């Protein structure tokens, strides 16, 4: 059966990538939270 | 500066080789020394080899050949340069 | 060897730099082939290039 995750790198990057995060205040707050938590991987990029 | 140095004659204060004398072959940064003929171990080398194991530097004393005893080192400035001296008789090492 | 290199001119330092970079190339090729026993030479020449470049920058 067709499951929910149907990977596409283009859609992944456009939806959740670094530049998508940087494009809005709320996306930049995601990056701020993840840097503050000390995440090794900030985004899907 | 270090009170015990490579090529010093020392006497063992502590351990199985207490009282034995030997020359400092090597000074380790761990605060240990290899002393010639002191603290021998039987290494099972992939033959059975006898070799010196490192001993704590505070378990050896500088040997004063004049008094024939373990001594303590102090430091003083003689003619600009820092020298070591035996505490027992105040003589420069 | 900075005291010796500091006596030279920009012309001479630039000559010395190319000599070292050529030496660095030859040692790299020797090391790759496995005909360099003396591995310590690689660091020596690398640090010598840094010294010459430092002094060229000081005179610049």
């Amino acid at each position: 059966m067709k499951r929910t995750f149907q990977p596409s790198v283009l859609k992944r990057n456009r939806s959740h990538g670094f530049r998508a995060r940087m494009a809005t205040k709320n996306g930049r707050q995601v990056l701020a939270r993840r840097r503050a938590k000390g995440r090794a991987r900030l985004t899907v990029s | 500066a270090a009170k015990i140095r490579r090529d010093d004659e020392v006497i063992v204060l502590t351990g199985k080789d207490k009282g034995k004398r030997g020359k400092v072959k090597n000074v380790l940064s761990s605060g240990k020394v290899i002393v010639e003929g002191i603290n021998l171990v039987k290494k099972h080398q992939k033959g059975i080899v006898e070799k010196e194991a490192a001993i704590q530097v505070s378990n050896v004393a500088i040997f004063n050949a004049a008094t024939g005893k373990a001594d303590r080192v102090g430091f003083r400035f003689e003619d600009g340069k820092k020298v070591r001296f035996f505490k027992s008789n105040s003589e420069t090492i | 060897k900075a005291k010796e290199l500091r006596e030279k001119s920009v012309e001479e330092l630039n000559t010395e730099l190319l000599n070292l970079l050529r030496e660095q190339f030859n040692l790299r090729m020797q090391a790759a082939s496995g005909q360099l026993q003396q591995s310590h030479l690689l660091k020596q020449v690398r640090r010598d290039v840094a010294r010459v470049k430092t002094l060229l920058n000081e005179k610049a």
Partner: protein, 93 residues
């Protein structure tokens, strides 16, 4: 024209393998490890200057580094650039 400083950094090592040995004997082609950012023009110039041969053409590829376990920890070897440098007929490097 490329500066000699640049040309002295682009060639890293000869690449030794069965394919490389066969390339030399059958097609007069030397296989080199080159700087990751080296262009075909730079490789050609560097080979002609430093090895004193005449180059017909340079083919290049990027070798992606292997993922490798050292103990438990995962690591990755670096990517590197390989150059197949075809020499002119009667050069004999």
């Amino acid at each position: 024209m490329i500066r000699e400083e640049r040309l002295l950094k682009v060639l890293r090592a000869p690449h030794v393998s069965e394919k490389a040995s066969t390339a030399m004997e059958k097609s007069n082609t030397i296989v080199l490890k080159v700087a990751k950012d080296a262009t075909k023009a730079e490789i050609k110039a560097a080979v002609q200057k430093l090895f004193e041969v005449e180059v017909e053409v340079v083919n290049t590829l990027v070798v992606k580094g292997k993922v490798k376990r050292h103990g438990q920890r995962i690591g990755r070897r670096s990517d590197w650039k390989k150059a197949y440098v075809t020499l002119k007929e009667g050069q004999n490097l």
